[PDB]
């Protein structure tokens, strides 16, 4: 048994969580993948040749400072807060269809199993959405091995080529989770909306 | 065989356990789910610009790099809600297990149900396993960064990447605040309403 | 084979002692230890308001722009793992004592009446699932003074990097956790172990039934 | 409520109309280009010892450079790895979209989309791997180089050099293959299965 | 197929059936009362766990640092004791795998008991294989912990480490004669029981 | 139903002819003459040594120090193998994608012409990780050997820094061995089990 | 054509070479085997009597000989090794030629084989292993007597080098075995199931 304060802030919580899932999912989404579709369309994430991004590599052939890549820094900037937003919504959403599990009772809960399907889906993308955060830690870790490493000895030519290498690798990789992070929201916006009926009331009322 | 005054002792381990859970599940859970929605909601969790977080770096491009004053004030307040969620899994996992009946051919529904609810707990268990190693692995992480950048002035990547973690970090807070909010708020969710079945499941 | 009549008398006197050594053990044992571990954490050894009191002093001479002495283990958290060794030998011991107790209760195979086999199977699956998470805290405690020492040594090597001596601290509070953590486990082992074989001793112990 | 279903509508049918023209024009141009360049004499030697670049150490050190011959297909492999992985990322989420609402019993029209899509998933697997080797590739000739330099006297760390470049050579020739079948493949199991992966139910 | 051939293969049978039943009727027996009082012996029995730490002779501002000598008397008699058992495992699961008759249609369920049995010998190998190579990396790690404690003597946790080691090696070899006492034990427990079925699964033909 | 443009189709159609043209003359003459040369191979004094002392590479240290070379019979095996491992997983790919493409619509009914070409990809696949791994071999080996020549010069005292840059030349001269073994293996393998299905995999529904 | 006959010689050699492997070699090696194990270099009465001389002034250092007593057993052994892969990977494709065209309905014949080769498959699992842990034991005994060499102050690197030993020693005692044991294995499973492998339909 619960006394009615605990009900109240529990309940309050469902309506706040209703209310914005409703919203969240009538506004937020359309408007968010209509924003990365263009965002993909813009010259930054469409160079034409992968060898304008060459960062200056500043080092002594027989070693002086050199900054990280300025062409992919600014795209990391615009990537950054996209990548914050959906792992909240997800994980919003996600939540929201666990509070709608209805009573576990006997016999083969139809509603239940919709549930489950679209709940594995939301486990899905969660999985591949967590990756991004450390891969952004990731690049320039490996990047300063490698800037250190060419520094370290200039004599090897592989060294040079291996940064410039995961320049061009780190770019194309900003463009699969922006595409990633569009389909993402796009696969949600159609499965929730598709199943809605069952989601909110599996058993009926 | 056992002998009666031994087993008194189990049997109030038991009815405290019982009696935690309910007073625990009533008032507790209910107010974590309230604090820990405020908690994110003010404006320490909510950096309007990431750009105002990145914390004083200074290398000659030696003198003494501090540790990120933003992330740590959170973290002290982070790390008594990560004991507190984990202490009070624990608590419920093992209340439920005492409320396995015996294991029997005919009349396992209600055990069925149990099993169901016990799926869900070691899946919060195994997301919040991680919260506990990740706060020494940030420190770690980090401190490599800053020593590597002093080590080498010259790689600009190696200054980018402790800017990079603290950024990094900021964000792991706010989903494990949320991880920990949605952790009671499913179990409170479920729990309440399989509490027929999960505390008699055969009936009786 | 016949086995021998000296032969069976070693066997059936270790049967008959983890039988005495099990039932005993049931009855006396668990009791005492629910309720040990239940008393072990409402002490305040392991209910410290502020885990800032148990920081170690951790001195290292500070550089500026213009060697180092003794740095000694937490002692706070040592006279706790002191309580807790024993109590970890304690537990693995008595639970591979009751898991060989229940696999020499599995009767001869017969394709019939083997639902008193399937009690005992479930039960034994719970007892794997112990042998798991009591198997990793053996070697968690080696592994923090292992990780504490590379990060104290370290500390000193590189004393400008202020994270590392934060990170001495935070493995400290960690610990603290942990260990916490692993009297409830034990606690909490020796509680579902109790309830389970109590309820469920009649088919264990006699699955066919006589 | 119903205004959301234009605007998820207009993108599919938007993602429709990109996937419809692309898996017919694009589809059949990219296995006709990547047949060919199979067959040109850049990815067919007679003797794997003309890649072998001059590795210049002294003997008992200077600028060694790397392997020309590999770096100049590797310019010409990383835009076809970027467009095949992009067209069948946005393959998949065409098929995804096209999953109607979860109804009742085995519904076999469901079960045709998962039978393509559980082969876009193993074509997907074998795909990632194929970015981050490249990377990859560098590093472990670096590593080679400079350890060939820092100890000289050992022949072995000469000979890896050659034999990462010669392997490289072959691994190069492969994802221009698979990447060639992966398109072949898709084109294949979608052309067949079109009715059913489009309208499932058939209304 | 050969004369003579055939002969050569039979006595290894006959080689072996002759070795498992005496060995099943008398080594078994003996190994399980041995092991047992091992355990009781006061060698593994340690009344307070600061009496097996040895001693760490570093100057603390480098002379030999010899191995646990406590520990070390308790390895000797442990080594040869895996040694045996691991070999009668081994023995005893090729027995039970010549055993199993042709593979008929349908099921027989003499070859199910056979395969039950069977797979308790493969999970019992499992753990006993962990055993053997745990005795050198126990050493090794050691070695590093006391090198490190050397290296830098201003560490007081490289010094507690060895002690924490040589406490954790000790509950090692505590838990490793408990599990070949006890493999022993349940090995001729469930061949005993299952013997009518073991070795002849198709019944008398 | 899809439209795709009739010379777009057109180009596709000669792909598969072009696959099919090549699996046909591939699978009857390159087969069976491979297994044979493979075979002979095997066969030849090179890979077959009784004595495995002879293929100790005189390894020079002082007991500074002067060049040590790879294992001179090593490396000429390596030379004629490459070429060995470069055609098999060419022309395993080429015969797996064949399968694909002769995989029919996905239909309710008649699902056994299906299920015999889905038990020969299963083998395919099967092949295909055990030949993945014989490509990165040759890489490993240098540089084992090579960190092991290195060790050796190093640290001269320890006599078993020695002992192991011979062990790897005894393990690699094996692997080598097996890894023709597994070729013709897998060409004999390939040929026996789509000659023996060649009518369901090529037409499984029936003929039309 | 003329090259189905290339594979029919080759299939009837296969099949000729696995009827004398078969009859002839596994009876032997079993034989041979069991009589390794029977021998005194085997059957070490103690085992401190393999511990090679480790000399170390307890840095400048004289040359750390290998251990003979085990390096001689490695000289039997690795010829042993070579054989049973060989003949597994013989026998392994000799079942996959006998497989059958793929026909409808479950053919028990065809369930036969599978069963079979899924114990081949197991073996082969065990014995690739074999093959290289003998790099590994000089290389790990070499980084050992080079920690050793290199800090002399430390007494557990001079008693992992004997450890290492030891262990070694008894892990060429069970590979012998295992190697018996899957000789033993597979002449029992192959003839047993004979009539079904060669001709299931």
Not at 9 to 26: A, P, Q
Not at 145 to 155: G, M, S, W
Request: include cysteine; proline fraction near 5%.
């Amino acid at each position: 048994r619960v006394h009615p304060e605990a009900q109240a802030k529990v309940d309050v919580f469902r309506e706040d969580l209703c209310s914005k899932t409703e919203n969240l999912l009538g506004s937020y989404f359309p408007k968010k993948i209509s924003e990365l579709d263009a965002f993909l369309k813009e010259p930054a994430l469409n160079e034409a040749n992968l060898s304008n991004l060459k960062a200056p590599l500043d080092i002594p052939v027989p070693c002086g400072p050199v900054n990280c890549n300025e062409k992919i820094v600014v795209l990391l900037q615009r990537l950054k807060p996209e990548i914050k937003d959906v792992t909240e919504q997800l994980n919003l959403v996600t939540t929201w269809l666990q509070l709608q599990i209805p009573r576990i009772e006997d016999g083969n809960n139809f509603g239940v199993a919709v549930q489950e399907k679209v709940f594995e889906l939301m486990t899905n993308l969660h999985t591949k959405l967590e990756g991004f955060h450390t891969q952004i830690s990731k690049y320039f870790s490996e990047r300063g091995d490698a800037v250190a490493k060419a520094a370290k000895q200039p004599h090897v030519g592989d060294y040079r080529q291996l940064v410039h290498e995961l320049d061009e690798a780190e770019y194309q990789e900003i463009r699969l989770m922006v595409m990633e992070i569009r389909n993402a929201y796009a696969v949600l916006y159609d499965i929730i909306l598709k199943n809605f009926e069952k989601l909110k009331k599996p058993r009926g009322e």
